[PDB]
């Protein structure tokens, strides 16, 4: 129907047009009559008839009188929906300002008038006079005058002095104000003004005034002369609370406003005293203020059960607010809830649905089928038949239930898998049954969990459900290309019992014809499940593409593994079943099945796995018992030894040898060591404890203990839980975070002491509360991520952008945290991937990386692959399909139109519940050590000491890959040469992190240039060295005279001729910071490369992720050099340490106000590159984006987010974070206007400025210059072009005011405001409709 939604400030004439009447009387209705009052808040004449087609008089009824206003009633007969359709207005005796424009963050009305807000509420609430049109008087028109000062000015000046009070005074001020004249005045002022803060204020004001100029809005329209009133259906006031028929709501606020307006009108009519008139105007203004927005005033109108009365804005905004309350989430028909039940007998695609629930859910379908059958002649008869519940109705239900898929929704829908459609199967029980494999996908349990069940109706809806919603379609989680239907608890245990080996069991050593014979032997009981036999296996190999080659061979496997082989389809190899088949093993099996065979064979395989696992787990008879728990015999001895050690440390503390803190640390260390020893002994006596006679000598075998079976198989509970169960629980930190000195030495099997239980409950309650706030913060973060990244859909198949992020495995030096295979999987290459051998192109320029390509890269050991990213694609309001890569859920290139943004937001948000809210370079293995960006000078010993602090020690193995990568600081000693093989386990570098040695460029003696001992920096004895040292004093440490002179260490010859630094004419002078230890005195020689001076020297959970996505400024951000240049001190840390950085080619030096206390990582006289860290600290993402490229900040933030997630063991593909990053930097600031229409001091969407740049490049015009600007997810969502979408996220008031003032017009086209509108969204099945609609323009 409509094509775009338009919002603008409403004029009083426009309001009169909407209104059909004026509400003169406050009382809404006469309760005894239950009839709308003639001038009342509910009036049939003003809005519409209370009873449809009934006049208040009742003279005109239904048809033949419809549309005609009977004079006596005064009400036109119309449908009752006209009540909510038709609006009204209330005349206000005093014009009253709209609080939303009156009070806001930037104070629209205050910003226009250049007046402090305080003056504004003073004049609005009649506390002072604004002297409008001072004229001949000294006061100007805009000034504010005090009441007594107003009287004095009246005495001094008469008709010329025209100070006035109230909202109408401000309206007159705005009317006198001219938009265009003040616009050019502001432009001239901005040209003249040279203060960037004053310039910022002027830019804000000029943007506001230009928004008024372009939009059809008037400043005086901000003050409401006429106040519209809500329709009566919207505020029905018809609660019928036991005949009371009354309640306290917005109607009360309207009543108060009308009462105040009537009082003011009658006071004006009666010529009331001016003080009383102004007080009444204050009351009316406050009433309208609270009505439009309660709490903006600062005083909340109350009296509804002594609770704040909800204002119209309050209904408009927040979860209570309708847009969140209903528009975003609407309750639906054909829906129901019930508890969950397992019912394994169901197939994966189908589910269990209660018989009674289905009859209610599918009742319209049942009525239709009955009518078509002719069993029900009429629909009323069909309704009666459903109530009767005759057998015929149940047969009709079976037909409707057969192919209408039902959506099953878990209560917290963190991810898309939360809602999955299933084919409903009628069940006698009153509980919905969910197939067991998909229960893990839902993250739901059977602890009375409840699922909402919805019934899609239309053929489009049913086809959509079957095609996409159905569980069989979503084998792989959208977050990671891994099976989300991985077997969870019982089937994995049953398979692990099945796929297990025993040294000796009945049937061992037999030869079996086939897996069928293995099953027959097992059922006969002649051979146990876990006895090894020599049985042939006919495995089909998919080596021929699309052809199965049968191979039959004798393989030494257990009977159980042979039986399970029947379940496995022909394509898969037999090696996968030959292992123990725990949880990761079965997940890998399912992944291989999906990769090699089709999805349907994978579904059948998964269902057969579940059935076989449940059956053989039941037959296994796995059981947990007290005797099953094993307590190591060495546990008590270890505990006694630990207690003796603790007593020894206590004696040392009493003797005074060890301090209280050191004693506490030693106690913690020894208790941790004892806990580790207890755990190791328990594992040794649990995992391999069983010794079984094996046709001869007894042989130790992996133990069949049920609890160890559960832990090792991964069915449920890690090794830590078992260690808490049978081994001593260990150290339990008290709630603040400090570890209790005495741990819990008693395992759960033994009785825990009362104090031990109290200590444990400390941490237990801490964890429970922290988990509650985890859920809260995870919900908030998920909402923010959805709102910022809602407007992301695949719109172009291929951008063709050659640019892309560089993808490399991440290594912290200890290990390769993320292998390259997983990171680049399902990602289209940015360019041709050449072999490490030069000029050999292994991978083409644009090819999607499936498993074969990723393996091929691994064989050729391509360490670094440059790959396309969503940030790289040049599509506006969309993403390249190739750039996004694989769908990660269907194992192929992302299909056009799929909404990747919401997928990624849900994928990131979901693990937040699991996320917890609260030197010597060792080389692992032999390889070539490599140094990059290294500035090292050999010392007297010849070992390499590096001035550069950006250099990294990335070791390269024989294949060419970076096995380990390390970082060395300023003046870091390097034991082994660069580029040569180093033996595993040796220390490559041996710097001391505490010290900060400064290397010497040229061998010579030191000289005191501004380092004179007498003025300051006097020799201070160093006890550890045994020699007095001329330590340089810090500015606060030294006297005022010392601050003026900046120390410079000149190097000279024996005679005294200065020795220049190599490559530069100036003598080698080293600028020494405060507290730098200058051990060597004047006239003491220093060898080249030796140390001339030595300078002595974060959240990991969900808050860290929130900080990263919000791009919040760290407390001490690391300073980065704006441009390559020479460093020097502008000031001696006077007020703020001033730093000058000037390049040789660039005249203009970047200037920084570095804090005095902050340590300077860079040497004072050092020459550094752009983006190099200047002060040690957390790097600011905004600075990273400004200095480096968008690709570099993308890599930084992705790495940090993944590292936070990698700690908790949850894997998320990088593209999910990447799209959120792309949405974060959607807004781009323009460096220079050029020929573009946008002013240089403006921020516009990067897409729009890119389109403008393409337009200017196509013709003969200057291209625009834009600086990419990182925005927090909350800010980016709030700053989106679609004002409806921004209002949905947060802070509806500010967004609505900004849209109204600027006259913003949303062109829909966003994935969310289409949800609010309710039309087709530009999602997968709506993208075609949206593009057809757009081309229809």
């Amino acid at each position: 129907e409509f094509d775009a939604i338009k919002i603008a400030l409403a004029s009083p004439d426009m309001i009169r047009s909407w209104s059909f009447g004026e509400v003169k009387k406050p009382e809404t209705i006469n309760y005894r009559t239950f009839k709308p009052e003639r001038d009342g808040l509910f009036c049939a004449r003003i809005f519409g008839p209370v009873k449809d087609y009934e006049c208040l008089c009742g003279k005109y009824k239904r048809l033949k009188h419809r549309g005609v206003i009977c004079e006596k009633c005064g009400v036109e007969v119309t449908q009752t929906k006209v009540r909510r359709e038709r609006m009204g207005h209330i005349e206000l005796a005093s014009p009253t300002a709209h609080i939303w424009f009156l009070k806001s963050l930037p104070s629209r009305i205050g910003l226009l008038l250049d007046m402090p807000l305080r003056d504004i509420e003073r004049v609005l609430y009649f506390e002072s006079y604004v002297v409008i049109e001072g004229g001949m008087t000294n006061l100007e028109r805009q000034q504010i005058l005090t009441e007594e000062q107003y009287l004095d000015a009246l005495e001094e000046f008469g008709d010329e002095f025209d100070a006035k009070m109230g909202a109408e005074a401000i309206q007159a001020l705005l009317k006198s104000m001219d938009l265009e004249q003040e616009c050019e005045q502001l432009r001239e002022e901005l040209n003249e003004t040279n203060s960037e803060t004053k310039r910022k204020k002027l830019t804000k004001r000029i943007k506001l005034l230009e928004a008024f100029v372009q939009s059809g809005n008037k400043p005086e329209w901000m003050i409401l002369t006429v106040l519209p009133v809500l329709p009566p259906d919207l505020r029905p006031l018809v609660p019928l609370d036991g005949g009371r028929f009354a309640t306290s709501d917005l109607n009360d606020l309207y009543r108060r406003v009308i009462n105040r307006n009537n009082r003011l009108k009658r006071l004006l009519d009666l010529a009331a005293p001016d003080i009383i008139v102004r007080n009444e105007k204050r009351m009316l203004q406050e009433a309208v203020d609270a009505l439009l927005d309660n709490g903006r005033r600062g005083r909340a109108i109350t009296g509804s059960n002594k609770r704040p009365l909800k204002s119209l804005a309050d209904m408009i905004k927040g979860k209570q607010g309708r847009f969140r309350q209903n528009l975003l989430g609407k309750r639906v028909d054909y829906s129901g809830r019930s508890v969950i039940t397992v019912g394994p007998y169901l197939r994966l695609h189908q589910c269990g649905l209660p018989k009674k629930m289905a009859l209610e859910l599918f009742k319209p379908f049942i009525y239709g089928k009955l009518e078509l059958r002719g069993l029900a002649t009429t629909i009323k008869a069909a309704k009666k038949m459903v109530e009767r519940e005759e057998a015929v109705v149940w047969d009709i239900l079976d037909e409707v239930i057969r192919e209408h898929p039902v959506l099953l929704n878990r209560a917290p829908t963190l991810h898309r898998l939360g809602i999955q459609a299933f084919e409903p199967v009628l069940i006698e029980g009153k509980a919905i049954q969910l197939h067991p494999l998909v229960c893990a996908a839902y993250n739901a349990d059977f602890d009375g969990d409840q699922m909402a069940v919805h019934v899609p109706l239309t053929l489009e809806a049913q086809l959509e459900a079957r095609a996409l919603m159905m569980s069989t379609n979503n084998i792989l989680s959208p977050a990671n290309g891994e099976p989300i239907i991985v077997p969870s608890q019982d089937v994995v245990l049953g398979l692990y019992y099945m796929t297990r080996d025993c040294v000796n069991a009945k049937g061992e050593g037999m030869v079996l014809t086939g897996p069928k014979e293995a099953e027959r032997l097992y059922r006969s009981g002649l051979a146990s499940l876990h006895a090894r036999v020599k049985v042939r296996i006919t495995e089909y190999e998919k080596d021929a593409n699309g052809e199965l080659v049968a191979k039959t061979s004798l393989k030494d496997t257990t009977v159980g593994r042979a039986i399970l082989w029947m379940i496995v389809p022909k394509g898969l190899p037999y090696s996968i079943v030959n292992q123990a088949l725990g949880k990761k093993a079965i997940s890998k099996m399912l992944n291989t099945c999906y990769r090699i065979l089709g999805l349907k064979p994978t579904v059948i395989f998964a269902d057969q796995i579940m059935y076989t696992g449940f059956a053989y787990a039941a037959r296994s008879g796995a059981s947990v018992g007290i005797d099953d728990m094993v307590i190591p015999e060495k546990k008590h001895e270890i505990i006694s030894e630990a207690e003796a050690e603790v007593a020894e440390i206590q004696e040392q503390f009493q003797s005074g040898l060890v301090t209280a803190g050191e004693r506490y640390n030693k106690v913690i260390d020894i208790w941790a060591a004892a806990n580790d020893r207890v755990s190791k002994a328990m594992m040794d006596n649990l995992q391999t404890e069983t010794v079984i006679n094996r046709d001869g000598q007894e042989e130790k075998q992996v133990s069949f203990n049920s609890i160890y079976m559960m832990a090792d198989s991964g069915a449920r509970g890690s090794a830590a839980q078992i260690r808490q169960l049978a081994g001593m629980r260990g150290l339990m930190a008290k709630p603040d975070g400090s570890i209790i000195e005495t741990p819990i030495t008693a395992n759960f099997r033994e009785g825990l002491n009362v104090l031990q239980y109290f200590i444990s409950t400390h941490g237990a309650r801490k964890g429970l509360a922290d988990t509650a706030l985890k859920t809260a913060n995870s919900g908030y973060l998920t909402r923010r991520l959805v709102d910022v990244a809602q407007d992301l859909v695949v719109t172009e198949d291929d951008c063709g952008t050659h640019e892309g992020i560089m993808m490399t495995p991440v290594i912290e030096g200890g290990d390769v945290k993320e292998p390259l295979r997983d990171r680049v999987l399902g990602r289209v290459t940015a360019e041709d991937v050449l072999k490490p051998g030069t000029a050999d192109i292994l991978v083409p320029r644009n090819t999607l990386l499936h498993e074969q390509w990723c393996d091929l890269l691994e064989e050729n050991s391509v360490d670094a692959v440059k790959v396309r990213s969503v940030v790289s694609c040049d599509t506006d309001f969309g993403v390249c399909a190739h750039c996004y890569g694989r769908d990660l859920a269907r194992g192929h290139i992302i299909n056009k139109g799929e909404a990747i943004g919401v997928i990624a937001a849900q994928s990131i948000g979901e693990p937040g519940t699991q996320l917890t809210m609260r030197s010597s370079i060792q080389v692992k293995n032999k390889g070539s050590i490599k140094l990059s960006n290294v500035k090292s000078v050999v010392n007297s010993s010849g070992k390499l000491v590096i001035t550069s602090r950006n250099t990294e020690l990335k070791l390269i193995d024989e294949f060419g890959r970076t096995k380990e990568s390390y970082k060395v600081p300023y003046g870091a000693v390097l034991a082994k040469g660069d580029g040569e093989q180093v033996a595993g386990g040796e220390t490559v570098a041996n710097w001391d992190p505490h010290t900060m040695p400064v290397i010497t460029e040229v061998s010579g003696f030191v000289r005191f240039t501004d380092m004179i001992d007498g003025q300051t920096i006097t020799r201070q004895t160093d006890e550890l060295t045994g020699l007095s040292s001329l330590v340089v004093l810090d500015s606060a440490e030294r006297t005022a005279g010392g601050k003026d002179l900046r120390p410079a260490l000149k190097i000279v010859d024996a005679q005294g001729n200065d020795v220049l630094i190599p490559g530069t004419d100036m003598p080698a002078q080293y600028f020494l910071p405060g507290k730098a230890i200058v051990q060597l005195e004047d006239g003491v020689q220093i060898s080249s490369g030796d140390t001339l001076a030595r300078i002595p020297q974060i959240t990991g959970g969900l808050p860290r992720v929130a900080d990263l996505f919000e791009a919040r400024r760290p407390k001490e951000p690391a300073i980065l050099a704006e441009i390559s240049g020479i460093v020097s001190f502008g000031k001696e840390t006077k007020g703020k340490r001033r730093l000058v950085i000037t390049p040789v080619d660039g005249s203009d030096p970047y200037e920084e106000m570095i804090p005095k206390w902050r340590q300077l990582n860079v040497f004072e006289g050092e020459r550094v590159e752009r983006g190099d860290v200047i002060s040690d600290g957390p790097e600011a993402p905004h600075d990273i984006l400004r200095l480096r490229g968008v690709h570099a900040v993308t890599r930084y933030i992705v790495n940090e987010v993944q590292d936070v997630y990698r700690l908790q063991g949850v894997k998320i593909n990088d593209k999910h974070i990447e799209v959120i990053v792309r949405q974060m930097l959607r807004k781009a600031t323009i460096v220079n206007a050029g020929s573009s229409d946008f002013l240089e001091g403006e921020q516009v969407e990067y897409s729009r400025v890119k389109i403008a740049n393409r337009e200017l490049e196509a013709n003969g015009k200057v291209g625009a210059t834009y600086s990419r600007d990182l925005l927090g997810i909350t800010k980016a969502s709030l700053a989106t072009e679609s004002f409806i979408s921004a209002a949905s996220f947060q802070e509806t008031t500010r967004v609505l005011t900004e849209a109204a003032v600027a006259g913003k017009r949303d062109e829909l086209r966003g994935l969310k405001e289409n949800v609010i509108v309710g039309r087709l969204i530009p999602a997968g099945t709506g993208y075609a409709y949206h593009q057809d609609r757009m081309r229809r323009r």
């Binding site: 197939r347 695609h349 189908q350 057969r402 192919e403 209408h404 084919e423 053929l459 489009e460 049913q462 086809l463 959509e464 079957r466 095609a467 996409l468 159905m470 069989t472 379609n473 089709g598 999805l599 349907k600 579904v603 269907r890 299909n895 056009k896 139109g897 799929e898 999602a1323 997968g1324 099945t1325 993208y1327 075609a1328």
Partner: protein
């Protein structure tokens, strides 16, 4: 009955497009008096439409040709 749509997505690459093309065929089968080309094994119209896509009997281009042919047939009926 088609419990897996993977073969149908092979026939229509977009998959989301497969829902739209199947919907038009299914609407023709139910609201209109259009014979199911695929044999009906006690199947609802939506499943028959999916089966027709898997068979290759119905594709977006084929549906368009049949609709155009019906429009020509209407002109012949007008005479």
């Amino acid at each position: 009955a088609r419990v897996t749509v993977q073969d149908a997505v092979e026939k229509i690459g977009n998959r989301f497009d497969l829902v739209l093309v199947a919907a038009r065929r299914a609407r023709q089968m139910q609201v209109g008096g259009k014979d199911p080309l695929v044999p009906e094994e006690n199947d609802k119209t939506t499943v028959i439409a999916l089966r027709e896509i898997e068979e290759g009997l119905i594709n977006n281009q084929i549906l368009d040709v049949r609709e155009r042919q019906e429009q020509q047939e209407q002109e012949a009926a007008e005479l």
